[PDB]
Enzyme design. Structure first.
Site, PDB file in Angstrom:
ATOM      1  N   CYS A 260      57.836 -15.976 -14.452  1.00 48.18           N
ATOM      2  CA  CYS A 260      58.113 -15.144 -14.817  1.00 48.18           C
ATOM      3  C   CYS A 260      58.301 -14.432 -13.002  1.00 48.18           C
ATOM      4  O   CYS A 260      57.182 -15.042 -12.571  1.00 48.18           O
ATOM      5  CB  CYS A 260      58.674 -14.721 -15.372  1.00 48.18           C
ATOM      6  SG  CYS A 260      58.670 -14.107 -17.049  1.00 48.18           S
TER       7      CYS A 260
ATOM      8  N   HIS B 264      59.942  -5.926 -14.816  1.00 51.74           N
ATOM      9  CA  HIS B 264      59.825  -6.087 -16.714  1.00 51.74           C
ATOM     10  C   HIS B 264      57.812  -6.074 -16.285  1.00 51.74           C
ATOM     11  O   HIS B 264      56.827  -6.456 -17.587  1.00 51.74           O
ATOM     12  CB  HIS B 264      59.791  -6.903 -18.080  1.00 51.74           C
ATOM     13  CG  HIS B 264      59.693  -8.220 -16.890  1.00 51.74           C
ATOM     14  ND1 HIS B 264      60.420  -9.195 -17.502  1.00 51.74           N
ATOM     15  CD2 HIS B 264      58.514  -9.140 -17.192  1.00 51.74           C
ATOM     16  CE1 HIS B 264      59.680 -10.544 -16.513  1.00 51.74           C
ATOM     17  NE2 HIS B 264      58.615 -10.317 -17.021  1.00 51.74           N
TER      18      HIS B 264
ATOM     19  N   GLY C 266      54.098 -17.023 -17.526  1.00 53.33           N
ATOM     20  CA  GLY C 266      53.481 -16.981 -17.056  1.00 53.33           C
ATOM     21  C   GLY C 266      54.573 -16.896 -15.381  1.00 53.33           C
ATOM     22  O   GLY C 266      54.079 -17.395 -13.879  1.00 53.33           O
TER      23      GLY C 266
END
Ligand SMILES: CCCN(CC(=O)Nc1ccccc1OC)C(=O)CCl
Lengths: 305, 306
Positions: free
Chosen positions: A145, A41, A143
């Protein structure tokens, strides 16, 4: 003596964390040999996230549309490819700090250490269990991820988790390092919810054993039970069934304390039926389920890495 | 979202951990530049426990009595002195992995990460606090002596604790990195009483602010309180006095949530009175006092969930 929620030393994993940027999306990647692993993603904008076509969105990107920062050094991307929900970015330079490692998939009830990072910069480490509903009770802001979960066995880092998303109840969802989601989740902005959670019975029993080893003993009783009997109590309080494999796994703690697993089950039965009557166990008013039998043994024996 | 006891990444400390042997006694040491710091009782035999004369045990030692091991490599000791209760072993190799660091003595209520180690090898990292009675609730087996506590603010490691011993109650005493004990403890096997432990009030308030930030208000109430009336109630539950300093320090968490410190004090008063009636706050059914105002600002969003 003493008992604490204890994470693995994070040094071997700190040396693998890098910043991955694709347009205005920044998140964390894992740099092992000449490949950076990160959530797919990363190639999406907010608009794209509503119903992404990943193979489609990917074909549109060249190697130079991926900025990879290892501290204050640029890594040149020379390759990209997807595996399930993770993006593999091939880079010109092998990570000199690459530890001995494997990718493994953990089961619900198994624990692991998370190294929380932001802009490829590790900010904290904590201990987690894969819940029976395949979520983790993490602590993550935007932030986070690409933050990873891991176990250390001797010198070997076993990577088990990569963080992808937060659910609306505030718990967290991610993949193994081969990009397979834990739980029935997908990497899309859509209506997703944690299923009904349950208590990890074998872990509660392991923690009761940790209490006995540390001289907390008041919940012991003269009574014993059977698997069948105890499991009817388990189901009633949203506890996982306890299996013969679970009793076998608790063998090392039943020997070390001279409390048979079905002895200790009779104590857990009583705690569930009657409550804690004002007392605590290992400085907790709740029955703790995020320590495995191995976690209890490892901390009450002092194995190093 | 979420709230967890978060330790600092241990990597910068792992690179400093060594093994120190004197006689049959092995514990951990901290290798920074060309100095290894470890507890002085590394030089104590079975009989020395009761009434050790460190000056007398030490003058009988040479450099080559001290085996220092950094992973597989043996370090050569070329010097030794005692500073308070730590031994400082000068070695011939500066630690190439020395991070930016400083030594700081902390006040009761402050948190830090512990890297528990055995034989100079790290086993695990956990978060804890300096209790008001100057002890820490650690996890520490035999051989853990010399394990260190630290904060990492930016790239700079602040060493604040070295572990020296377990008290009869299962709790841990140690020193700053200049060898001075926290609390009235001594490196002797005599009857030392851990003072009565109190709850770190400023930390509980910080953690209640945490619970609001993450969108939980069920425990607030319409009341307020004076500083002094809160302190008279809180000390009947074995909670530390709250001071103007503590109130000033909660300012930023007050502003982010819109709840005046004394209104939050009113909420804590009521929580002490009522318990929780089968509810939790950030997944705990007790009031948690091992998170500081600074830790809450660190780990919690800047945006409250209203
Ligand atoms: C290194 C061997 C084990 N050990 C020594 C220890 O704990 N000794 C001690 C220190 C101060 C007061 C009393 C003591 O014991 C009688 C540690 O882990 C540290």
């Amino acid at each position: 003596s003493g008992f604490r929620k204890m994470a693995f030393p994070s040094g071997k994993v700190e040396g693998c964390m890098v910043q991955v940027t694709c347009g205005t999306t920044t998140l964390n990647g894992l740099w092992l040999d000449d490949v950076v692993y990160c959530p797919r993603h990363v190639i999406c904008t907010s608009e794209d996230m509503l119903n992404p076509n990943y193979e489609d969105l990917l074909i549109r990107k060249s190697n130079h549309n991926f900025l990879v920062q290892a501290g204050n050094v640029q890594l040149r991307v020379i390759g990209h490819s997807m595996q399930n929900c993770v993006l593999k970015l091939k880079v010109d330079t092998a990570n000199p700090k690459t530890p001995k490692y494997k990718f493994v998939r953990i089961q619900p009830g198994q624990t692991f250490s998370v190294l929380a990072c932001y802009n490829g910069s590790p900010s904290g480490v904590y201990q987690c269990a894969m819940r029976p509903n395949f979520t983790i009770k993490g602590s993550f802001l935007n932030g986070s991820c690409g933050s990873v979960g891991f176990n250390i066995d001797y010198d070997c880092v076993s990577f088990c988790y990569m963080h992808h998303m937060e659910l609306p109840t505030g718990v967290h969802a991610g993949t193994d390092l081969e990009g397979n989601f834990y739980g029935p989740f997908v990497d899309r902005q859509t209506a997703q919810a944690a299923g009904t959670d349950t208590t990890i019975t074998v872990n509660v029993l392991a923690w009761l054993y940790a209490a006995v080893i540390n001289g907390d003993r008041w919940f012991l009783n003269r009574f014993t039970t059977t698997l069948n009997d105890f499991n009817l109590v388990a189901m009633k309080y949203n506890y996982e069934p306890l299996t013969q494999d679970h009793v076998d796994i608790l063998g090392p703690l039943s020997a070390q304390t001279g409390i048979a697993v079905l002895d200790m089950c009779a104590s857990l039965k009583e705690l569930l039926q009657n409550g804690m009557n004002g007392r605590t166990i290992l400085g907790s008013a709740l029955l703790e389920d995020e320590f495995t039998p191995f976690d209890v043994v490892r901390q009450c024996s002092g194995v190093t890495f």
